[PDB]
């Protein structure tokens, strides 16, 4: 599923990401845009054999189990396939754990490079939440 900008903003708000750990809603929408281009089915391989999954490109090295990343962890205690659903529940729940792991939203490299410090509110502007 390829979410629309406002469609995702509304869903993320309902899933409690607005101001989560001090990060306004726009940060999360912006992160999804540059990580997955709003595609819930996005999968991208990393050089270490791990893979990034879903709307927020959560990796199998530490967060989910995809059964093909030896010596990795599954801190979110979920199959990586759960992060590829049209329903963002699993991705949001895992993202909430990630953002509290010590580096805030810096865990998302695309957010760090394209969103951090910018007018992220523009990503939810004009949207019905």
């Amino acid at each position: 599923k390829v979410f629309g900008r406002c469609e995702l903003a509304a869903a993320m708000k309902r899933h409690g990401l607005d101001n989560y750990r001090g990060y306004s809603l726009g940060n999360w929408v912006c992160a999804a845009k540059f990580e997955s281009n709003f595609n819930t089915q996005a999968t991208n391989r990393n050089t270490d054999g791990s893979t990034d999954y879903g709307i927020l490109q959560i990796n199998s090295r530490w967060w989910c189990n995809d059964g093909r990343t030896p010596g990795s962890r599954n801190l979110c205690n979920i199959p990586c396939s759960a992060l590829l659903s049209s329903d963002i529940t699993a991705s949001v729940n895992c993202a909430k754990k990630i953002v509290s792991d010590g580096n805030g939203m810096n865990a998302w490299v695309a957010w760090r490079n394209r969103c951090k410090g910018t007018d992220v509110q523009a990503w939810i502007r004009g949207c019905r939440l």
Partner: nanobody, 123 residues
Framework: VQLQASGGGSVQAGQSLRLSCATS???????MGWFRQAPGKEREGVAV????????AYADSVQGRLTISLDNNTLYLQMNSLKPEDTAMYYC?????????????????????WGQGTQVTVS
Amino acid sequence: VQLQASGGGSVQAGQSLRLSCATSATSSSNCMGWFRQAPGKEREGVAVIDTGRGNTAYADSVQGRLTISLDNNTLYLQMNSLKPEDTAMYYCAADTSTWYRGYCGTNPNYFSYWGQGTQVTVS
């Protein structure tokens, strides 16, 4: 001449091209790669390499045809069996070592550095 891409050209499908870029790579970056862009379109990740380990990753669209390598200080992109869909501007990119990265990915948004691009046209 830093991160300046070259090697592009206009060729028939099936032929090959070898893109290159100068670096200065294992000290200032964790990851280096190549991304491409068509007029009015978004950047598309093509290949990436871990500057320290040498491990690589590719986009599904170029898997088995393109090869990224680092001759620590030149970055190469061997393009074999070119397809019409490969037509676009190619750029070489790098990230910053000021941030830890235990692995690398092709997402263009994972790289804050890049230089001049080179055109690849395949008919």
